[PDB]
Design a protein around this nucleic acid. Structure first.
Length: 308
RNA sequence: AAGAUUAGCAUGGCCCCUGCACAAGGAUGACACUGCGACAUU
């Protein structure tokens, strides 16, 4: 029960949505609480921070009266609603002709919490248009048997954020069915104690000298022009929006051929940034990680092999 | 008496080269969803 821990979780939700917002128009963002508890403080803090629109789920009657009492003494009914769900029906509620849910948050009990995440994984396969799913774990030992289940369904857009507040080490496992990819501070922690269950990398760094710090923009423009990768110059940021891989030997051997194979297919949106002689490659959108691993190792080889 | 970290080696994919495809191999520098633990501390 830590107010800075719950606020840090809502701040992870904000950092997860914000780094994965894109260039789209600012719609009203809709959240979905799962098991809001007897306090119901999670959607309250979300609306106090950035004016989200929560339609929370509930399995209790006394806590539903408590949630309505918190609604009555907080008065945000165009933001906060609480809905009693059923036990056999999908706990992820319908759209009902409303505007689509955007992010889903879950405070499971502490079948177990692994089986609860299994039920949410089973129900979440049917919900399209909903972008973000999260689930927070207290025990470290729940990390394997959930992620291994998530290692059964080829879900690559997940992440484990290490909530570190003294003796409180929580692990946020966030998975999504849409291609948006958050930062690397958000999904892969520093401690290697769960290096068996890290998600994939979304950020790569390289360090240079002021010679190559002067030459870094010419190197990046020559790289993104000599490879037919679509790019744009937004300030000092070089943004990249490809819909298939146009940077590998396999891609050339196919391009330099005659068969009717279309392309090696996987969508990527990413950014190149120059911070203090450093080049950062930073992954924004894409279902398949192999596209971004290929691009980051091609960029590493491009920064190395222009030194001679 | 009970185990992690840590320095080298197999394995896995990624960039480069050979290769019609699948393979296989080479070379190379960053990785880890795999292990192998010659020291030293806890």
């Amino acid at each position: 029960p830590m107010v800075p821990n719950r606020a840090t979780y809502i701040r992870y939700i904000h950092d997860l949505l914000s780094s994965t917002s894109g260039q789209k128009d600012k719609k009203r963002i809709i959240g979905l609480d799962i098991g809001t508890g007897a306090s119901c403080i999670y959607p309250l803090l979300g609306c106090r921070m950035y004016s989200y629109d929560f339609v929370g789920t509930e399995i209790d009657k006394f806590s539903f009266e408590t949630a309505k009492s918190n609604i009555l003494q907080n008065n945000m009914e165009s933001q906060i609603k609480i809905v009693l769900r059923s036990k056999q029906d999908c706990l992820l509620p319908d759209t009902e002709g409303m505007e689509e849910f955007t992010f889903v948050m879950c405070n499971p009990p502490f079948g177990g919490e692994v089986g609860f995440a299994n039920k949410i994984l089973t129900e979440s396969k049917k919900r399209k248009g909903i972008q973000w799913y999260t689930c927070m774990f207290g025990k470290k030992s729940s990390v394997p048997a959930v992620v291994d289940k998530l290692r059964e369904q080829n879900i690559s857009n997940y992440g484990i954020y290490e909530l570190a507040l003294g003796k409180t080490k929580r692990w946020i496992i966030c998975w999504s069915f849409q291609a948006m990819r958050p930062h690397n501070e958000l999904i892969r922690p520093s401690s290697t104690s769960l290096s068996k269950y890290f998600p994939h990398k979304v950020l790569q760094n390289w360090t240079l000298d002021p010679e190559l710090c002067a030459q870094i923009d010419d190197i990046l423009q020559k790289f993104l022009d000599d490879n037919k990768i679509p790019w744009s110059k937004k300030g000092s940021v070089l943004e990249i929006s490809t819909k298939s891989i146009t940077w590998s030997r396999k891609a050339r051997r196919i391009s330099k051929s005659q068969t009717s194979v279309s392309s090696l297919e996987g969508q990527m949106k990413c950014e190149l940034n120059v911070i203090d002689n450093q080049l950062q490659c930073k992954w924004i959108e894409g279902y398949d990680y192999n596209v971004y691993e290929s691009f980051c190792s091609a960029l590493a080889r491009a920064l190395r092999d222009n030194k001679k």
